[PDB]
Design an enzyme around this catalytic site. Structure first.
Site, PDB file in Angstrom:
ATOM      1  CG  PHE A   1       6.934  -7.738 -10.433  1.00  0.00           C
ATOM      2  CD1 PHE A   1       6.251  -7.472  -9.441  1.00  0.00           C
ATOM      3  CD2 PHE A   1       7.738  -9.002 -10.253  1.00  0.00           C
ATOM      4  CE1 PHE A   1       6.070  -8.356  -8.060  1.00  0.00           C
ATOM      5  CE2 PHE A   1       7.568  -9.618  -9.046  1.00  0.00           C
ATOM      6  CZ  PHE A   1       6.679  -9.293  -7.919  1.00  0.00           C
ATOM      7  CG  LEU A   2      12.728  -4.131 -10.167  1.00  0.00           C
ATOM      8  CD1 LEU A   2      13.221  -4.814 -11.422  1.00  0.00           C
ATOM      9  CD2 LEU A   2      11.611  -3.079 -10.322  1.00  0.00           C
TER      10      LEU A   2
ATOM     11  CG  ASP B   1       7.091  10.686   0.155  1.00  0.00           C
ATOM     12  OD1 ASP B   1       7.720  11.007   1.397  1.00  0.00           O
ATOM     13  OD2 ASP B   1       5.896  10.033   0.110  1.00  0.00           O
TER      14      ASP B   1
ATOM     15  CE  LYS C   1       1.526   3.492  -6.217  1.00  0.00           C
ATOM     16  NZ  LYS C   1       2.541   4.643  -6.502  1.00  0.00           N
TER      17      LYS C   1
ATOM     18  CD  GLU D   1      -2.631  -1.158   2.450  1.00  0.00           C
ATOM     19  OE1 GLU D   1      -2.434  -0.369   3.386  1.00  0.00           O
ATOM     20  OE2 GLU D   1      -3.658  -2.067   2.450  1.00  0.00           O
TER      21      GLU D   1
ATOM     22  CE1 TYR E   1      -0.200  11.049  -3.159  1.00  0.00           C
ATOM     23  CE2 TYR E   1       1.572   9.654  -4.165  1.00  0.00           C
ATOM     24  CZ  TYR E   1       1.228  10.819  -3.519  1.00  0.00           C
ATOM     25  OH  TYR E   1       2.120  11.776  -3.318  1.00  0.00           O
TER      26      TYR E   1
HETATM   27  C1  LIG Z   1       3.501   1.199 -10.803  1.00  0.00           C
HETATM   28  C2  LIG Z   1       3.631   0.454  -9.445  1.00  0.00           C
HETATM   29  C3  LIG Z   1       4.443   1.349  -8.213  1.00  0.00           C
HETATM   30  O1  LIG Z   1       3.808   2.476  -8.291  1.00  0.00           O
HETATM   31  N1  LIG Z   1       5.357   1.101  -7.475  1.00  0.00           N
HETATM   32  C4  LIG Z   1       5.465   1.982  -6.223  1.00  0.00           C
HETATM   33  C5  LIG Z   1       6.176   1.217  -5.276  1.00  0.00           C
HETATM   34  C6  LIG Z   1       5.455  -0.360  -4.902  1.00  0.00           C
HETATM   35  C7  LIG Z   1       6.023  -0.973  -6.190  1.00  0.00           C
HETATM   36  C8  LIG Z   1       6.637  -2.156  -6.056  1.00  0.00           C
HETATM   37  C9  LIG Z   1       7.153  -2.808  -7.272  1.00  0.00           C
HETATM   38  C10 LIG Z   1       7.729  -4.259  -7.452  1.00  0.00           C
HETATM   39  O2  LIG Z   1       8.357  -4.701  -8.453  1.00  0.00           O
HETATM   40  O3  LIG Z   1       7.803  -4.904  -6.267  1.00  0.00           O
HETATM   41  C11 LIG Z   1       8.603  -6.161  -6.206  1.00  0.00           C
HETATM   42  C12 LIG Z   1       6.953  -2.078  -8.646  1.00  0.00           C
HETATM   43  C13 LIG Z   1       6.571  -0.729  -8.643  1.00  0.00           C
HETATM   44  C14 LIG Z   1       6.113  -0.166  -7.483  1.00  0.00           C
END
Ligand SMILES: *CCC(=O)N1CCCc2cc(C(=O)OC)ccc21
Length: 292
Positions: free
Chosen positions: A78-79, A123, A37, A16, A19
């Site tokens: 995605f990471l 931020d 998101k 979470e 936003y």
């Molecule tokens: C578009 C997705 C996004 O806004 N974010 C903000 C931080 C949360 C998050 C997490 C990943 C991820 O790859 O978790 C492994 C990617 C992008 C985001």
């Protein structure tokens, strides 16, 4: 866009944010696995859409921006996980110094890039720093604070952390410069090294007074204009500045030098990301593989 019959099938909830919620999702058409998101405002759509071209290896890739049925969705690559989870997984031993140094070097590259395109984050915090299993780290959510503001509480009423917030923001400056991100990253550098947050304030005045207790109460000598800031009070207690040597042991002298420069009070004196990359701290930088 996210559902049984939609462009994107939900795999699991990731986190979470300020936003909205972030889901791991799969796109039915491309096979791609993404982070999606969901946020529940025209100027903001134009601004955020411009971020699709702000591509760099240390910036989380913004795949798409969708405005539909009164929602805004951002589709990101995605990471593995965020740095807050990695620091927690790493707590008994700490992140090894060479990996801290590689992550800081890569984060300064992503800042240097966004700042050269006149985009600031405002931020930064460990939860928006994402790592992969190969040794890379990337910044998420650039440009979203300029679009929406930074609220006091999230959409789920959670407290938005103050711990990484620069002093000019706390003192009510009207203009924020790219220096605000170097301050946040210096605080994150210190937390990786010491395994504790540098300034874990629980209110705006606790955050300010934690900063003054370590770095000295600022005055006109070190920060011209400070006594004229909106939220500055002449009644603030006058604390003496601590040595870095006490603040971030066992960081070496080059690391303390760089950190001191990332934490200057005057945003004009604060080191820029481009200049930080040239600092001698990075003379021996490597790219280690993280132990996951
Ligand atoms: C578009 C997705 C996004 O806004 N974010 C903000 C931080 C949360 C998050 C997490 C990943 C991820 O790859 O978790 C492994 C990617 C992008 C985001």
């Amino acid at each position: 866009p996210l559902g049984s019959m939609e462009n994107f099938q939900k795999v699991e909830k990731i986190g979470e944010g300020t936003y909205g919620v972030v889901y791991k999702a799969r796109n039915k058409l491309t096979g791609e696995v993404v982070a999606l998101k969901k946020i529940r405002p025209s100027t903001a759509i134009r601004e955020i859409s411009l971020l699709k071209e702000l591509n760099h290896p240390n910036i989380v890739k913004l795949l798409d921006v969708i405005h539909t049925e009164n929602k805004l969705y951002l589709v990101c690559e995605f990471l593995h996980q965020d740095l807050k989870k990695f620091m927690d997984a790493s707590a008994l031993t700490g992140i090894p110094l060479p990996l801290i140094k590689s992550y800081l070097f890569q984060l300064l590259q992503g800042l240097a890039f966004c700042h050269s395109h006149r985009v600031l984050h405002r931020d930064l915090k460990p939860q928006n720093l994402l790592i992969n299993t190969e040794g890379a780290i990337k910044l998420a959510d650039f440009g979203l604070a300029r679009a929406f503001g930074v609220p006091v509480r999230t959409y789920t009423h959670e407290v938005v952390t103050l711990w990484y917030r620069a002093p000019e923001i706390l003192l009510g400056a009207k203009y924020y410069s790219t220096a605000v991100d170097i301050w946040s990253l210096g605080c994150i550098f210190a937390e990786m090294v010491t395994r504790r947050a540098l300034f874990p304030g629980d209110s705006e005045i606790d955050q300010l007074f934690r900063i003054f207790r370590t770095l000295g109460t600022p005055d006109e000598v070190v920060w011209p204009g400070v006594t004229s800031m909106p939220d500055y009070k002449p009644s603030f207690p006058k604390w003496a500045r601590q040595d870095f040597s006490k603040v971030v042991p066992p960081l070496d002298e080059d690391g303390r030098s760089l950190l001191s420069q990332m934490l200057h009070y005057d945003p004009n004196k604060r080191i820029s990301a481009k200049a930080a990359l040239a600092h001698p701290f990075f003379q021996d930088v490597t790219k280690p593989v993280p132990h996951l």
